[PDB]
């Protein structure tokens, strides 16, 4: 991103992430045991990589909720909301905001920004809830949308990996003539970039990288390299030195990929019921 | 544009309404080879009013300098640096409706003394 | 732009002089519409024309014109 | 600390002032929006797009959201306090007719309009106003409420947007699709003031606007775009015979009539582009743009 | 990088997912404007 902004965003590696996780869930903890509500290490209070789990499940039945939207949504919206989501609980834990309320709101602050213009109907029909209830939701929304920005630093902008997909298939079409109608290549991509959605992937890597990577993956599984691809590329600055990062950088997706996995149902369900018994647990703010 | 104190330029309608406060505007009718549009009273016509901005916003400013009610008409060229600053550049008089560049006592005299001889 | 005064027809005249032989011949009497000067000065019109044209009329057809006035 | 009411917004309140932490000057903006609704639909569009914008295009000719909070319902949004604005400077009777000075101004708006379209986002509304002087005099464009992305992707783009007075051409039929052309035809309106000294195109209503400005270019010649008639709803305005730019605006020296006559251009894809302009000689010649330490002030 | 003008395969493709089209193209918008759009933003970035 040229275009900065993101250029401070953009966290580097793996151990910054999950240290950052860490700290915030052990700020939930202090703040309430100084506030002496409990006496401290309870069993209530939860672990960082079981929140991380909960979240990635519940992060998935989200992104089949945008799928299931009424209206036809651009992949951009999409994904925006998914970015937002996960930068959000970079700086809170689940307890603090119940998973659902910050789905939810997520995703109208984004199709806000990105123009799509909804139709109130077309929202609440999407939703299978009562009306009273939804209501109820929304109404918790609208608190939850400025406290999203708030600590979200008011940085909104999210680059989405598409616009870079269909651009390097532009230059495929015109600089290399090697390979040859690229659209087996193209659906291949596609399912390169949801499972590459789903990992921190889109905190570290760069996303123009990202999309080059889905398609070296696509062309390998297929029977196509890019080695000439890639030296046109090295038609460029750093003389030799370019392709060496490019190959660890892909070597290291394909690692997060292989390993990546859904959490399991039954896990998510226990830890489901921890975390509902935890919000139900008392906090209450201030007077 | 070959030669500016070679050049005449008349217009009938501006003949009869002449008067003090107009000489200036038909040095103005444009079209007219001795005045340019690079001039400022050209640009305060295009923006509004004309008082003391030509001491505020100093620079190319046709100011009449003598005047005879029927026919004569003197106008001068000034370049102002600034407020109580002026630099004469040329002259242009009006005999009959009619304008002439001042001629150089000397471009004036060389030419004559060339035909003479 | 700067138009002079006039200039002499310079479009015909090198034709007049020829050789003093096979000359343009008076060119004939367009009985029509001319352009002298600016106005147009087309032949067939009448003298007084009637107020009738660009105006009202307050005077019957009898116009004994001593007694109208 | 709060310090100054300047006064409300269309959707938004100013204060100036000093903000918690340091003395500086600074413009601080409030939150505005019917809240009525028990389903109000959070912040509103404008909003979110101006913020973010803001924040993103940083630009010695683009103002930015610097600091941002919102611990109460309220928003807090962090923009510099400026002079004043060109508009109203232009608008009063003639205190200081400044000619290089405009040329001065007009550099300063078409650097920062040149960032924005590099930046690749469409400033949807550069109005009269909406254009901000600050101390030193450097102009900054401000109001970005009503802006949007450009790209690729087919996707329902905004119609019937800018303030009738600059209205482009295209848009003023009812164009789906659009480009660069707006902000473009807009500064042009904006140059066409100060030459001028009072509005260009003045319309009353939609209808109105589109006749003037056909009146004030002549009827676009079928060469220029066929298909302007195409778009989806033009209606044929009079046959005009049609006026030179040496009509509207009597004249001027004849590189800023380039100018004009270049901005106004009707194809869309000839209207001309940022690079475009600067990169003209007029900017480049023996008329010096003013540094703006000797920029006109009024009161 | 990448030039603004194209006059190249990629404009002798003039292909989208639409490609171009007619009427809407008095609006301008010509995908020239479009590839443009798309490739600047890709190649944004590559290497942090």
Redesign the interface.
């Known amino acids: 991103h040229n275009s900065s902004q993101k250029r401070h965003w953009t966290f580097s590696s793996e151990e910054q992430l999950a240290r950052l996780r860490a700290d915030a869930n052990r700020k939930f903890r202090c703040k309430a045991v100084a506030n002496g509500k409990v006496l401290p290490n309870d069993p209530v209070f939860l672990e960082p990589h079981e929140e991380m789990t909960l979240c990635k499940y519940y992060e998935k039945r989200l992104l089949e909720f945008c799928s299931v939207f009424k209206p036809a949504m651009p992949r951009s919206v999409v994904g925006t909301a998914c970015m937002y989501f996960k930068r959000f609980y970079l700086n809170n834990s689940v307890m603090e905001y119940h998973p659902r309320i910050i789905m939810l709101t997520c995703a109208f602050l984004a199709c806000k920004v990105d123009e799509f213009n909804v139709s109130s109907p077309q929202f609440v029909g999407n939703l299978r809830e009562s009306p009273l209830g939804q209501e109820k939701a929304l109404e918790q929304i609208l608190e939850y949308e400025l406290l999203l920005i708030q600590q979200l630093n008011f940085h909104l902008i999210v680059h989405n990996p598409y616009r870079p997909f269909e651009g390097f298939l532009i230059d495929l079409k015109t600089r290399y003539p090697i390979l040859e109608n690229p659209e087996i290549l193209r659906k291949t991509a596609d399912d390169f970039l949801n499972r590459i959605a789903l990992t921190d992937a889109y905190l570290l890597y760069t996303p123009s990288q990202i999309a080059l990577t889905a398609i070296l993956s696509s062309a390998s599984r297929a029977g196509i390299t890019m080695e000439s691809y890639l030296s046109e590329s090295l038609m460029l600055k750093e003389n030799r030195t370019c392709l060496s990062q490019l190959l660890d950088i892909m070597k290291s997706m394909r690692n997060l990929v292989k390993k990546y996995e859904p959490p399991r149902s039954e896990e998510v369900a226990v830890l489901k019921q921890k975390l509902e018994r935890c919000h139900s647990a008392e906090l209450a703010l201030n007077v | 544009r070959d030669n500016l104190l070679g050049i005449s330029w008349v217009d009938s309608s501006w003949i009869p309404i002449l008067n003090s406060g107009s000489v200036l505007d038909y040095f103005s009718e444009r079209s007219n080879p001795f005045y340019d549009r690079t001039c400022n009273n050209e640009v305060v016509k295009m923006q509004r009013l004309t008082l003391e901005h030509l001491n505020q916003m100093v620079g190319i400013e046709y100011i009449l300098l003598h005047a005879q009610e029927p026919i004569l008409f003197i106008i001068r060229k000034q370049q102002r640096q600034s407020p109580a600053q002026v630099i004469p550049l040329a002259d242009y008089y009006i005999i009959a409706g009619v304008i002439y560049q001042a001629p150089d006592l000397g471009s004036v005299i060389n030419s004559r003394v060339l035909t003479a001889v | 732009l700067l138009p002079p005064p006039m200039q002499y027809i310079k479009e015909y005249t090198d034709e007049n002089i020829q050789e003093g032989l096979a000359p343009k011949p008076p060119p004939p009497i367009k009985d029509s519409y001319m352009m002298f000067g600016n106005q147009f000065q087309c032949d067939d019109l009448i003298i007084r024309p009637l107020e009738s044209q660009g105006i009202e009329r307050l005077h019957p057809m009898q116009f004994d014109h001593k007694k109208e006035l | 600390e709060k310090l100054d009411f300047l006064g409300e917004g269309q959707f938004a309140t100013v204060y100036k002032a000093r903000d918690k932490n340091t003395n500086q000057i600074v413009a601080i903006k409030k939150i505005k929006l019917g809240h009525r609704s028990?389903?109000?639909?959070?912040?509103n569009?404008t909003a979110?797009?101006e913020?973010?914008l803001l924040?993103?295009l940083?630009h010695p000719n683009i103002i930015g959201?610097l600091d941002?909070?919102?611990?109460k319902?309220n928003?807090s949004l962090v923009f510099d306090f400026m002079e004043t604005d060109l508009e109203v400077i232009i608008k009063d009777?003639?205190l200081?007719?400044?000619?290089s000075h405009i040329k001065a101004y007009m550099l300063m708006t078409l650097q920062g309009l040149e960032y924005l379209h590099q930046?690749?986002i469409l400033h949807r509304d550069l109005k009269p106003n909406n254009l901000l002087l600050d101390e030193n005099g450097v102009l900054k464009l401000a109001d970005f409420g009503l802006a949007?992305?450009?790209?690729?992707?087919?996707?329902?783009?905004?119609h019937q947007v800018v303030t009738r007075w600059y209205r482009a051409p295209?848009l003023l039929?009812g164009?789906?699709?659009?480009?660069v052309?707006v902000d473009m035809w807009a500064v042009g309106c904006i140059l066409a003031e100060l030459?001028?000294?009072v509005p260009f195109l003045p319309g009353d209503s939609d209808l109105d606007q589109l006749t003037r400005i056909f009146e004030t270019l002549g009827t676009p010649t079928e060469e220029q775009?066929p298909?302007?008639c195409?778009?989806?709803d033009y209606v044929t305005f009079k046959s005009f015979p049609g006026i030179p730019l040496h009509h509207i605006?009597?004249?001027?020296?004849?590189d800023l009539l380039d100018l004009i006559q270049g901005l106004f251009l009707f194809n869309?894809?000839a209207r001309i582009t940022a690079t475009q302009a600067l990169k003209m000689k007029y900017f480049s010649n023996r008329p010096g743009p003013t540094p703006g330490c000797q920029l006109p002030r009024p009161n | 990088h990448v030039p603004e003008l194209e006059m190249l395969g990629r404009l002798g493709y003039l292909n989208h997912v639409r490609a171009a089209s007619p009427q809407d193209l008095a609006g301008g918008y010509t995908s020239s404007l479009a590839c443009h759009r798309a490739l600047q933003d890709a190649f944004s970035g590559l290497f942090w």
Request: proline share 6%; with cysteine; charged share 20%.
């Open positions: 028990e389903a109000k639909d959070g912040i569009r979110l797009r913020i973010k924040q993103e940083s959201l941002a909070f919102g611990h319902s928003i009777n003639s200081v007719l400044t000619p930046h690749w949007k992305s450009f790209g690729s992707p087919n996707r329902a783009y905004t295209e039929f164009a789906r699709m659009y480009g052309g030459l001028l000294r775009w298909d302007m195409s778009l989806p605006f009597s004249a001027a020296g004849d869309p894809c």
